[PDB]
Amino acid sequence: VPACTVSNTTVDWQDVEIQTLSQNGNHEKEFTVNMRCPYNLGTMKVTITATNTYNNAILVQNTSNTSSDGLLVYLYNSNAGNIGTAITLGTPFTPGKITGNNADKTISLHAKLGYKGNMQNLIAGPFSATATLVASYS
């Protein structure tokens, strides 16, 4: 069936003090993703992938003195506004919070910031990373 057409979006943490980061991930942030799903019978399956990763987290480039270390973005499903089970990159999951009775659908997800390597090697300054999100019903 036709896959949904996902609208680009951005999750912005603004200022994040390095000293306050938890290696396991904190600074929890909820965000939404809007999409157009002409075919919406059955259940929606979403798969999120990224080019730079580490143990199921998105590895943010240029955020550590050691190029293979750095800031980490962990993604989680949502359960009625509450953080849900962690998302395994590259595998399908059904969003726990979906809104929109028509072809216009909106899902809610959660993200946390963590880091790889020593906190002292983290580099201050603007950071950016991206992930691909595909969604389709079945």
Binding site: T5, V6, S7, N8, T9, T10, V11, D12, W13, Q14, D15, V16, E17, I18, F31, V33, M35, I48, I58, V60, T63, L71, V73, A111, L113, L122, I123, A124, G125, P126, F127, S128, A129, T130, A131, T132, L133
Partner: peptide, 11 residues
């Protein structure tokens, strides 16, 4: 599509 994650790490 894509989801961008951004921010500013401060010392």
């Amino acid at each position: 599509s894509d989801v961008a994650f951004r921010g500013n790490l401060l010392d």
